Scaffold this active site. Structure first.
Site, PDB file in Angstrom:
ATOM      1  N   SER D 366      66.301  29.883  43.302  1.00 44.18           N
ATOM      2  CA  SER D 366      65.590  30.266  44.499  1.00 44.18           C
ATOM      3  C   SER D 366      65.836  29.171  45.472  1.00 44.18           C
ATOM      4  N   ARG D 367      66.522  29.466  46.607  1.00 42.63           N
ATOM      5  CA  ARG D 367      67.064  28.429  47.456  1.00 42.63           C
ATOM      6  C   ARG D 367      66.012  27.519  48.012  1.00 42.63           C
ATOM      7  N   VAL D 368      64.911  28.087  48.540  1.00 47.30           N
ATOM      8  CA  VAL D 368      63.859  27.306  49.138  1.00 47.30           C
ATOM      9  C   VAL D 368      62.570  27.694  48.492  1.00 47.30           C
TER      10      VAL D 368
END
Lengths: 62, 56, 51, 499
Positions: D366-368
């Site tokens: 989950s990138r951020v």
């Protein structure tokens, strides 16, 4: 115009007359009255318990 | 309230560990816990007793 | 009870729907089919002049 | 009653106005019609044919316009009169779409009559700029452990859900909607997501099961369902995600938090492929047209966590990608992956092999996502991903002799994996996930024999509530595990371990 002809004919000549409440009932779940499950009477009641407790609670196992 | 009962109970479970006996102790503990937990699920299960005939 | 009540309204509506179809077939029989073309004609005369 | 409503409707038929309408259909079939006239026509208009069906003008060409029929070709025929709606494709948007199933024309397929809708808004709308965009801070809680822990999910983000067909594909998302029943049936509108379930390319029967489940969990009232079933026409399917997102944007542009799950964008690709081919525009890789990237990217970036200026609205996207064989290099999946923040790849092999829900931890990112997590779920879940990527390593090389260090990790790891699993279509509360993760992390579940793990969970939770639900209430409000709470919880958890 066409609105009037259709309106007149349709409205006037259509007569509602649906199913009775008795007929309706089949197609639904019917009313449920109170349930009245009484009051259960539990164990550890009566002198069955008392004699049992004096005797039982004279010796217990590890 | 019920938390008092359980604090003394579990303190007693680990105390009962340190003394002889446990034959019917665990069945008693199981029973009071059982119905207490049944009542907790009851108390969360409870919805208002009334038909909302305001809209219905 | 509420559910079947809604169902009865829908059933009534589809019954009155096939009655609308019956009324349409009747309308298109009449030489109201002819006479109403005159009504449309004058209405269009009024309408298009209002443009 | 029925007579009065019909009569009101009949009265509402009243006169036709003159205006620029009328083109005449010529070459028609192949789901596009070539119309003669329509001299002044706005681009991407909605036209309604006198075949009683509507189409979107695509190609405005010198002397001809090529409508694309948004609907069945069966009723359209040569030399029919095409009347200009005169308006670009817009769909009703508003507040009253909540708890109404609608199809792609916005027709109430819940059949609860006309939908209450504030406005209508154009189907294509550009995504908000850099300046309206505030970095995520509020989480979305799915109620499934590891899907909040290992995979941290937060509002606004385009958080991909990728995996293989009918692995109860829908269920992961349904559980999210269900967990957020608690918060959405809350009174705080900052804690209200208005969640939209876009059902594209699914059997109308299946959708009816979904609808029935949602109404069983009484979840219909906070959610909209848009439907564009498999039978329903491909151009309608093409416009189906875009329209849904417009509705979502009305909530977002009320500054109110929302979420949209696009099930399944892979089927939109097949639809766009069909459409493109029938427009005889050249095909791309895997026969999916070259503007397929543009199609997905324009759709996806409309989902965002806006800034304070825009009232800090969210529209959290969860797009559901159906991989053909777990073809993770396949053109459509890779294109989606590049757009999306993170992946939530679901491990099919493990799913079959009795891990429900099965999350391929390696292929979930989950990138951020992790700064959306609340501090309780950062502290308690601290390094559990690493630990279970040590379990991942451990079981990699487990396949002879095991050193006690390795064995300890394996014993914890195997047991922890058991802990992750959840019963399909029954998600846990957010509050409840905090202690469970606490237990294993703080090594309380190290000793617990594998057989009793399921028992441990239920009993532990019951124990916590009965002994002191006060702790859980505190962690519920504080949302941060204080040192006192941490110690108290260590003590309490140890107490449960004993029993």
């Amino acid at each position: 115009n066409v609105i009037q002809d259709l309106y007149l004919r349709e409205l006037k000549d259509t007569k509602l007359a649906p199913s009775t409440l008795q007929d309706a009932e089949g197609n639904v779940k019917p009313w449920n009255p109170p349930q009245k499950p009484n009051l259960p009477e539990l164990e550890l009641q009566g002198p069955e318990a008392l004699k049992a407790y004096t005797e039982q609670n004279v010796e217990t196992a590890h | 309230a019920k938390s008092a009962a359980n604090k003394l109970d579990w303190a007693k479970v680990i105390s009962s560990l340190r003394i002889t006996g446990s034959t019917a102790t665990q069945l008693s503990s199981f029973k009071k816990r059982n119905d207490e937990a049944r009542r907790q699920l009851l108390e969360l299960q409870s919805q208002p007793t009334e038909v909302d005939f305001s809209h219905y | 009870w509420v559910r079947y009540e809604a169902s009865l309204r829908q059933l009534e509506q589809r019954q009155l729907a096939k009655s609308v179809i019956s009324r349409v077939q009747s309308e298109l029989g009449n030489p109201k089919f002819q006479e109403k073309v005159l009504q449309q004609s004058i209405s269009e005369i009024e309408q298009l002049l209002s443009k | 009653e029925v007579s009065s409503i019909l009569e009101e409707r009949i009265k509402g038929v009243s006169d036709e106005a003159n205006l620029n309408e009328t083109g005449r259909v010529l070459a028609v079939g192949d789901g596009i019609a070539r119309v003669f006239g329509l001299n002044n026509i706005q681009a991407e208009e909605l036209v309604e044919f006198s075949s009683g069906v509507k189409g979107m003008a695509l190609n405005l060409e010198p002397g001809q316009v090529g409508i694309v029929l948004f609907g069945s070709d069966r009723l359209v025929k040569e030399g029919e009169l095409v009347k200009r709606t005169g308006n670009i494709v817009d769909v009703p948007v508003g507040p009253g779409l909540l708890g109404r199933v609608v199809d792609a024309l916005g027709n109430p397929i819940d059949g609860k009559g006309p939908i209450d809708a504030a406005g209508r808004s154009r189907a294509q709308v550009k995504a908000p700029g850099i300046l309206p965009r505030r970095s995520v801070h509020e989480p979305v809680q799915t109620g499934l452990k590891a899907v909040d822990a290992l995979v941290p999910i937060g509002r606004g983000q385009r958080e991909l859900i990728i995996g293989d067909r009918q692995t109860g594909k829908t269920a992961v998302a349904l559980d999210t909607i269900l967990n957020q029943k608690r918060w959405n049936n809350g009174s705080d509108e900052s804690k209200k997501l208005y969640c939209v379930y876009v059902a594209v390319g699914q059997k109308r029967s299946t959708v009816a099961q979904l609808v029935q489940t949602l109404e069983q969990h009484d979840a219909m009232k906070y959610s909209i369902i848009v439907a564009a079933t498999a039978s329903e026409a491909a151009p309608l399917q093409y416009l189906a995600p875009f329209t849904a997102a417009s509705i979502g944007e009305w909530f977002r542009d009320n500054g109110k938090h929302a979420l949209i799950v696009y099930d399944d964008l892979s089927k939109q690709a097949v639809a766009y492929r069909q459409l493109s081919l029938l427009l005889r525009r050249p095909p791309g890789r895997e026969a999916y047209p070259g503007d397929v990237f543009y199609l997905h990217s324009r759709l996806l970036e409309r989902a965002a966590k806006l800034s304070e200026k825009e009232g800090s609205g969210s529209l959290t996207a969860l797009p559901v990608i159906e991989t053909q064989g777990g073809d993770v290099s396949a053109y459509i999946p890779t294109n989606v992956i590049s757009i999306t923040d993170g992946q939530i790849f679901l491990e099919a092999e493990l799913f079959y092999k009795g891990i429900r829900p099965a999350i391929n931890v390696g292929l979930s990112v989950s990138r951020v996502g992790s700064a959306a997590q609340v501090k309780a779920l950062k502290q308690v879940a601290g390094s559990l991903k690493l630990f279970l990527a040590q379990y991942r390593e451990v079981a990699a090389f487990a396949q002879s002799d095991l050193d006690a260090s390795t064995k300890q990790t394996l014993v914890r790891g195997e047991r922890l994996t058991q802990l992750l699993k959840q019963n399909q279509y029954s998600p846990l509360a957010t509050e409840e996930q905090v202690p469970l993760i606490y237990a294993g992390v703080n090594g309380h579940l190290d000793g617990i024999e594998l057989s009793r793990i399921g028992e441990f969970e239920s009993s532990f939770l019951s124990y916590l509530k009965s002994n002191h639900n006060e702790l859980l209430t505190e962690i519920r409000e504080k949302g941060e595990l204080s040192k006192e709470l941490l110690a108290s919880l260590k003590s309490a958890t140890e107490s449960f371990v004993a029993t």
